[PDB]
Amino acid sequence: GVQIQIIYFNLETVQVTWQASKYSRTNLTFHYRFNGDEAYDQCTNYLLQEGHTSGCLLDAEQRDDILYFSIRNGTHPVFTASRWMVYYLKPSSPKHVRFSWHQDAVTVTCSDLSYGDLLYEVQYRSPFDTEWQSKQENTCNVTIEGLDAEKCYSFWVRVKAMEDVYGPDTYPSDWSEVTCWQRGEIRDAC
Amino acid sequence: DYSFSCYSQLEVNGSQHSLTCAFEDPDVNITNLEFEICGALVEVKCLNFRKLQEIYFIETKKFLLIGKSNICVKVGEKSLTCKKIDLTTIVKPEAPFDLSVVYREGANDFVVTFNTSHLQKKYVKVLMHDVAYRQEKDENKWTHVNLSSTKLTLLQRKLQPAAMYEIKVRSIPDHYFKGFWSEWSPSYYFRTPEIN
Amino acid sequence: MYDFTNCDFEKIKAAYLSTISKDLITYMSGTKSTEFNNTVSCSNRPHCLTEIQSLTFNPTAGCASLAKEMFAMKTKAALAIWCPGYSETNKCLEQVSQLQGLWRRFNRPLLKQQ
Ligand SMILES: *[C@@H]1O[C@H](CO)[C@@H](O)[C@H](O)[C@H]1NC(C)=O
Ligand SMILES: *[C@@H]1O[C@H](CO)[C@@H](O)[C@H](O)[C@H]1NC(C)=O
């Protein structure tokens, strides 16, 4: 009956949201902890939808732990689960994106995050390309050689967590603003 | 010295791997010599190589891929020379294939693409590719380009016009596997347009 | 009993990323990763190897023994080489899921905890 979603926004905030039409027009409570030997604390930051509780926000303070939680119809637990929080990591969108051109090459840099094992990916294309081409690195300094100064290229960047460290169920960041470039100068459309 | 070299291929045939060794001196007497691998194996101490023409070959799922093994050249029971090697550091990838080049009329470039079986493997799934091209007439004026993808683009204005060009590609392991360059893919030939 | 304090963690980490990780995923093939409840935690790399040791080799209830699995044989081999003085209802998938989290946490020693 209870459908649940978890997001760990940029290693700052955990958001757990739930849906259950049975317990609609009713405020279910959310209780959590970060260890299996401590008492549960109650949610101090509730999200609502259609006037009733639909989620919880926890400030996790960059901590890498197993979140243990339960949703209750008062005292009666309706849903119980436990998960490593970083499995639902969504890194923040690339900030301060800069491009430096040299003849038929470009180096795209941006502000690196405070946590490691991430992939900073740059996607690009010209009007002659049918799909986006991609290059990625461990830091936000990706160099793409062999392009054409004479062509217009659309570009955008994002941050992904590495599957070997964070597992397969993470979310890529949102892509940064799209930028268009011909002959080492910025443009409007492409 | 009775020195030799080796290379491994992980998941070459299904989930089984291969270990291939050959002597550095080609003119040696092989009638009396046999190779033996000992250590970092699954539920066995040693395994024997098959003497096939001028090479020694193994093919099995019993490679542990943790720690070093001991590859020894044997003349009966006595070991003439011994080499301690980790099979994850002598990996030789399977060579790329379906290499092809297409001229794009409007773009004025050549889209080079190729394929590799390593994309469908579990272990050695990350490689660095080396695309080499030249004018078929020249000698050692080869131009090398390293890339992680299977698609590359050459500009028409950065190549000689009305010229036959040759292009081939090879791969080496990357990301927690070390080793050697694969064999080159078959070459692909293309003529560039004239100055018109 | 045993301190995994003087281990060559970087060599162990390389072994995990090469093939152990992949062997754990092949064992878990056919399961939905988001469906598992994670219950065993670890802090630093010595503590993670302590918990990995127990879950891979100590026979629990629900799972008789994972010792004959390829991932376990490689784990035993990595610890013998790189840890000095190291002595050596089918809820196995649930338990291997717990191992996967500890191995992964062993690769994130810079992240803080409560
Ligand atoms: C749920 O909480 C909201 C916000 O305080 C309130 O408007 C609503 O009356 C509550 N619902 C119930 C079931 O009492
Ligand atoms: C990008 O990295 C390369 C080498 O690591 C270096 O030459 C270049 O200065 C770097 N760029 C920035 C802005 O850090």
Residue numbers in the entry:
A (entry chain C): 29 to 218
B (entry chain B): 37 to 232
C (entry chain A): 28 to 115, 134 to 159
Tell me what the authors wrote about this structure, in their words.
Thymic stromal lymphopoietin (TSLP), is an interleukin-2 (IL-2) family cytokine produced in response to pathogenic stimuli by skin keratinocytes and epithelial cells in the lung and gut. It regulates immunity at barrier surfaces by driving the activation of immature dendritic cells (DCs), mast cells, basophils, eosinophils and lymphocytes into a type 2 polarizing phenotype34. Consistent with annotations of human TSLP as a member of the IL-2 family of cytokines, its mature sequence (residues 29–159) adopts a four-helix bundle with ‘up-up-down-down' topology stabilized by three disulfide bridges (Cys34-Cys110, Cys69-Cys75 and Cys90-Cys137), in which the four α-helices—designated αA, αB, αC, αD—are threaded via a BC loop and two long overhand AB and CD loop regions, with the latter largely invisible in the electron density maps.
Crystallization trials using purified TSLPΔ127–131:TSLPRN47Q:IL-7Rα complex lead to optimized crystals that diffracted synchrotron X-rays to 2.55 Å resolution, and enabled determination of the crystal structure of the human TSLP:TSLPR:IL-7Rα complex by molecular replacement. Our crystallographic analysis contributes structural insights at high-resolution of human TSLP and TSLPR and reveals how TSLP wedges between TSLPR and IL-7Rα to mediate a T-shaped extracellular assembly, as further supported by small-angle X-ray scattering. TSLP and TSLPR display pronounced electrostatic complementarity spanning the entire site I, with TSLP presenting a positively charged surface patch associating with the negatively charged interdomain elbow of TSLPR. In particular, TSLP employs the C-terminal half of αD (residues 142–152), the C-terminal short tail extending from αD (residues 153–158) and a continuous stretch of 10 residues located in the long overhand AB-loop region (residues 60–69) to interact with a complementary interaction epitope formed at the elbow tip of the CHR-module of TSLPR. Human TSLPR uses three regions to grasp TSLP and buries ∼1,900 Å2 of solvent exposed surface area: (1) the intersheet EF1 loop and N-terminal residues of the F strand of TSLPRD1 (residues 91–96), (2) the C-terminal residues of TSLPRD1 strand G and the interdomain linker connecting TSLPRD1 and TSLPRD2 (residues 110–116) and (3) the α-helical turn located in the FG2 loop of TSLPRD2 (residues 192–195).
